[PDB]
Every structure is written in C-alpha cells, then in structure tokens.
From a paper:
The substrate-bound LONP1 structure was resolved to ~3.2 Å resolution, which enabled atomic model building and refinement. Whereas the AAA+ ring of bacterial Lon consists of four descending ATPase domains in its spiral staircase with two ascending ‘seam’ subunits, our substrate-bound structure of human LONP1 contains five descending ATPase domain subunits with a single ‘seam’ subunit transitioning between the highest and lowest subunits. Accordingly, the four topmost subunits of the staircase are bound to ATPγS (hereafter referred to as ATP for simplicity) while the lowest subunit contains ADP in its nucleotide-binding site. Density corresponding to an ADP molecule is also observed in the ‘seam’, or transitional subunit. The ATPases in our human LONP1 reconstruction encircle a density accommodating a 12-residue peptide substrate (modeled as a polyalanine chain due to ambiguity of substrate sequence), which is surprisingly nearly twice the length of the engaged substrate visualized in substrate-bound Y. pestis Lon31. This second pore loop residue assembles into a spiral that parallels the pore loop 1 aromatic, with Y599 from ATP1 and ATP2 engaged with the trapped substrate. Surprisingly, despite having a peptide substrate tightly bound within the channel, the protease domains of substrate-bound human LONP1 do not adopt a sixfold symmetric configuration. Further, we observe all six protease active sites to be in an inactive configuration, wherein a loop containing the catalytic serine residue (S855) is folded into a 310 helix, sterically occluding substrate access to the catalytic active site.
The human mitochondrial AAA+ protein LONP1 is a critical quality control protease involved in regulating diverse aspects of mitochondrial biology including proteostasis, electron transport chain activity, and mitochondrial transcription. The LONP1 protease consists of an N-terminal domain involved in substrate recognition and oligomerization, a AAA+ (ATPases associated with diverse cellular activities) domain that powers substrate translocation, and a C-terminal serine protease domain involved in substrate proteolysis. Here, we determine structures for human LONP1 in three different states: substrate-free, substrate-bound, and both substrate- and bortezomib-bound.
Residue numbers in the entry:
A (entry chain C): 416 to 770
B (entry chain B): 420 to 770
The structure:
Amino acid sequence: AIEEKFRERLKELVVPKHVMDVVDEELSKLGLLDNHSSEFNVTRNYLDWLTSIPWGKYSNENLDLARAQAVLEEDHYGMEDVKKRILEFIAVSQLRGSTQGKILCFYGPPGVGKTSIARSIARALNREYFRFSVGGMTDVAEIKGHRRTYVGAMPGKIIQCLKKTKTENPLILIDEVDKIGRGYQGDPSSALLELLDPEQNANFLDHYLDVPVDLSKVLFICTANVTDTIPEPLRDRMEMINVSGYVAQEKLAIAERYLVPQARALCGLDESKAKLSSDVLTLLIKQYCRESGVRNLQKQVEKVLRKSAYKIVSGEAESVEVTPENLQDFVGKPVFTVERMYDVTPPGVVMGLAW
Amino acid sequence: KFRERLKELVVPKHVMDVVDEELSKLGLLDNHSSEFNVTRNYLDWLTSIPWGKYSNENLDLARAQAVLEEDHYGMEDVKKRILEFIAVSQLRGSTQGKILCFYGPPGVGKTSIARSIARALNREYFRFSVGGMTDVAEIKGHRRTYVGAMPGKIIQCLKKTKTENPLILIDEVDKIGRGYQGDPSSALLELLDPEQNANFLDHYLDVPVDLSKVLFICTANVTDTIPEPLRDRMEMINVSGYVAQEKLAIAERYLVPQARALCGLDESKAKLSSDVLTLLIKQYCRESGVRNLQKQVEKVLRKSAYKIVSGEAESVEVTPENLQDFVGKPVFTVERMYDVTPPGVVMGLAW
Ligand SMILES: Nc1ncnc2c1ncn2[C@@H]1O[C@H](COP(=O)(O)OP(=O)(O)OP(=O)(O)O)[C@@H](O)[C@H]1O
Ligand SMILES: Nc1ncnc2c1ncn2[C@@H]1O[C@H](COP(=O)(O)OP(=O)(O)OP(=O)(O)O)[C@@H](O)[C@H]1O
Ligand SMILES: [Mg+2]
Ligand SMILES: [Mg+2]
C-alpha cells in the first residue's frame, strides 16, 4: 500500500542506518493502526517527511575552472576576493574526491554585491540555491522546527530547504545575519550556533525529525553588514570575507557593463533614443555618486532614463541626447563641487589626509 | 506477550508492577481501539528503555590516558578529572556518575573532548544540544493522553544507547530559552540534581528512572547566564586557551594533517614548516582558541591547491617571506617603534 510507496521512495536514496531503523519502526507502527484514527496520519506525515528528504542525493557539481570563472565574471564586475574564494573551493573539491561544504560570511557596506553574488555562485558551482532571510526574526522554531505532538508541526526551514531542493548539496544563503532578533520571543542566534558548527554540523537534528541530518556538505553563505552585532561564537564559526566598495573606475565599469544595459532593458529605451556616453557617466559618478555601493548610481541612471523616456512618449523630442552640460537638467544640482578651499596655502596652513 | 524484553534485563519492582498492570489492561482490551494503541505504545516504550544493563566501561588508567592523549593536546585539568573519575570507579567496585561543566572561550575543545572521554571510558555518547530551546517538552515529554506523545530527549537517549550510564553532552547550557514559551531551566535543574537523579520522572512514563550513573557534561561559554541554583549543581571546570607553543603543537599534530586530508595534499606538494607556522601564529592567530588558526591553515593549503590545479606550479613552498601573499596583511606587526632606543625612551612591557 502506502508502505510500498515509501519503500520505493527510499530505494534510490542511500539512507544511513539510524534513519532506516526509525523508518522501519514507523512502518511497523503504521501497519497496525486504523485509518480512521489521528495517530495514523501523524505517523503517515512523519514517514512522508522522513522519506522526502534526500539522504544521499548530491548535485552534479561543475568542476571546470574555466566555465566557473566565465559564469562568475559575466555577472559581477569586481569582487576578486569572492571569486578567488569560489575558484579555490572548486580546486579543492577537485583535488579531493567528493563534494564539500563551508561556512562563509560576506560583510561590507550596503550596495555592494553581497546578496546578489550568491545566486551567481550557485549557478557557477551548479549547486542548488535557497535564500533564507533572518532579518529581525525571533522564532527559533523557524530553525529547529516543532515536535510531532503538536498539530501543525513542521520541520524548519533548513529541512524544508533540503526537501524542496532534492539534494544534500545546496548553497544556503542566510541574509542579514547580523539583524537577527534576540528578543523576549526567542533567541534564534543560538540555534544558528548549533547549525553553523563546522564539526557538529555533520549531525544536526531539528525537533520534528528526531534523527540527525548531515549538513556538512552544504555551502552556507551568511551576509552581514556590520560585524560587532554578531556574537563571538558565531563570528568564530564563520569565515569572515570583506566585500569592500568600489572606486570611481570600477563604478564606471559596472555602470557601462551592467547598470545602464539593465536600466535600458527595463525602461524600453535603446541607444538611439537616449544615449549615455562614458564621459557623462564619469561626470555623474564624480559629481553625484561617492558611496561604496552602486545602488545610488543605479537610481541616478534610471532617473536619467525616465526623464528621457518621458520626453519620448509626449512630444518633447524623438531622441534625447545627454551631455556634460545638461546633466543638471536630469539629475539636479551636483552634490560634490570643489575639493580645495586653498589653491595656494598661506604660511600657516597645511594639507593633510584624513580617513 | 513480550516479556522476553524484560528477560534480557533486570527491572525494578515498581516498573515491573506497572508493566504487569498494563499487560492486564492490554489483555482485557481488543484491537482497533484507541486505548489499545495507547497502552501498546506505552508498554513498547516501557520495555524498550534499558533497566539494569550497563556497558562494560574501561577501567584501565594507562589505556585511558593513551586514548585520551591521542585525540587532543594539553587539556590537563580535564584529563586529570577523567582519570580521577576512573580511579574512584576503581576504588568503589561499581559504576559512577557525575555532572561536569566545561566553560571557556570559543574554540578551545569543550564540545570536542566529550566524544574522546566517551572513547576512553567505553561509554555510549549522546550530544543533544539545547541552544535556544524553549519548551520543556524536549526534556520531559508529554502525557500519554495526547495523540502523538513521546518521551523526552533523555529517555530517547536511554532507549537509543540501550544502556544506562551513557555520556550525555548538553551543549550551550548557558543559551537555553527563558522567554515567553516555557522555561526548561527548571527541568534541567531537576535533571542535573545529584539528589534527584535517582528518580527522574519524565511526563510520558509515569515511572521514575534512575539516572545516577549517567555522566553528564555541559558546555558553556559564560557562567553568568546560568542561574545560580544550576551553577551550584555542576562541577565548574574552566577550559582555558592555549599559548603560542601549545597552538603550534596543535597545528603540527592535528590541524595541518586534518587539513591535508580534507584538501587532498601532502607534505611533498605543500610544505608547512614549524617556523612558518610560528610566524602565522604570531602575526595572525593571536587568540585563545584554535578555529582561527585552522582557518589560516586551510587558507594556505587551499590557495596552494588552486595554484597546483590551475597548472601554475606542481609543488608550492610557503616561506616566511612568501606567507604574505597567502594569508594577506599581517594582523600584528613584528617591527617595533625603536630597534635601538635613543636617550629618553625606555622599553617597558604592560598587561
Ligand atoms: N560588481 C557588481 N556588478 C554588477 N552588479 C552589481 C555589482 N555590485 C552590485 N551590483 C548590483 O547592485 C545591487 C546590489 O544589491 P545587493 O543586494 O547585492 O546589496 P547588499 O550588499 O546585499 O545590500 P544589503 O547591505 O542591503 O544586504 C544588485 O542589484 C546587484 O545586481
Ligand atoms: N587541545 C586541542 N587539541 C586538538 N584540537 C583542538 C584542541 N582544542 C580545540 N581543538 C579543535 O577545535 C575544534 C573546535 O573546537 P570546539 O568546537 O569543540 O570548541 P568549543 O569549546 O565547542 O567552542 P564553542 O564554545 O564555541 O562551542 C575541534 O575540531 C578541535 O579539534
Ligand atoms: Mg542584501
Ligand atoms: Mg561547542
């Protein structure tokens, strides 16, 4: 009956011994239970969860550094530290025999590609992707699940990740890990401590499955903004990698290669109707965008493009041409104008650098 | 029915009477009954947990010292505590149970020495971390009345180990939930009490279970967040950090070999010498624990492996001059303000 379905689910997987023992016990208990009862469907849902988890299924990982570097460099400009870390991860997974897992943390100012690089890394490694956002959450149940005794019990987001991704090689992104709750309603950072332990992660048990799951071959990537908020044992468990900002040159390269093309794709405009030269981009960056991230530059580019597109749909023009002389018309008054207050230093003044 | 389960045990009187009453109540009932299912599951659990059987724990001081020294390095007060445990278990002709607590900075080996202590004493090992746990159900269980009820973590541990006197390592005993939902600290205060271990009385089984032979170990990062009646029940043992020399011994004996195995390299492909390791520990890994030194070791071997695979080289050599482009900028500077002091300035050292 249903027991045959569960056995046929389990056949392809390579289950460990304790899991197979628990499954045998549960099938033996289900065999002698009347369908009209609620114990029956409690046990049936437990067997559902126990068999829907991929016990040995691993993704077919890409181990070609050429292809990995190509896919890694066709979606984000800089980030040499991150790209090198991923390439070394690949080289190690190849020099050893099998897949492996790590616990990384990307930290840096807002606007750099801390969140957007994870999906690219997943596509590069040909691993499965899953984004779990812990910003402000206080429910430890979202990490460890609830016991079976309760009515609407569920295993927790990590086990649901494994079930929904059908492999034990996912790239789990934990977004805004320094903004987690830590309140009267719960302190999920401690469960996160038990989850992201480089040595005990091999046997992590949530409270729904009383059996431990091997999360050692899972690529965990936490993204934080500041570090002093993360507690000391977490900071110890993770490998902090700094993703700094960008200088004007890198911002210009980003604008030319990704930001402006994507903004054009969104607004519908092409290079004929509205053209942004490299020189007006350099001027825009110099005069308006002096942050580490690129979100402000993205907003300024889309501002220029909306202003252009509004003249097209009405009768103001058929093509808009942006020059370093009429940039104030689009993005407004410049923000950064002059750097020196003294062109010739009098006897008593001296120019020093300051961070 | 299944009294052979008790034949392979030595059960006490009260649980025997409970099993007999429940077997009668099972006999006078019929199948297809909710009460039949409840009582059958109850007898299943009751006769599942072991009742008088112990593991034949090792009691050889030299063998235990060898197996304890093989795994870690220089946790001397912990190893002495375990050896004294064995000496007492020898002078008294029976098994023994204690309640220890290891507290110290992160990465010093508190959670890692427990499995080695279990290997030494030939006891069974259970971890059961409690970080962030909120509900008492995980310690004590639910009554038989509820559908889907089952005993707590301790009774499931007993059933799984199939023996009393296992070793239970309750992690993060200072990070237990004390918020709105539940307060399992009182359950732990009843469980880790040496005068009430002999009758534990979880909620599912109405019988009391003797837990006096279980060797409990609880790891904590700070004792401040442990309530005083609970600190007063544990033997607080401080696991302090390691100095540069102990860190070097750890790196040579454990860290670098394990990283070699995890990265697929050997000594001939990438050579980490004692002097470059000393320099790494001095300029980068200036902490109390070991995880950061392990991270640096993995970093060096990993960049080595990438250089080899990409075809750049076939054998990497990490020298105290070539270390910079492997681990980055040194977190601490070896050069001092004055290698030769002029008049007026004198070198003093502080704390
Ligand atoms: N080097 C880059 N190349 C191309 N696009 C980039 C680059 N850096 C950032 N971006 C783009 O800029 C935006 C950055 O957003 P992202 O979510 O990565 O920032 P974040 O660091 O996660 O911010 P927060 O601090 O809020 O988490 C994304 O749209 C991303 O596509
Ligand atoms: N003396 C030692 N010899 C060998 N390895 C050690 C030693 N001390 C620590 N380690 C290593 O440190 C790693 C992690 O240590 P562990 O996680 O047990 O520390 P911890 O006290 O649990 O930290 P936390 O308090 O943050 O949980 C282990 O893999 C262990 O091998
Ligand atoms: Mg983000
Ligand atoms: Mg620990």
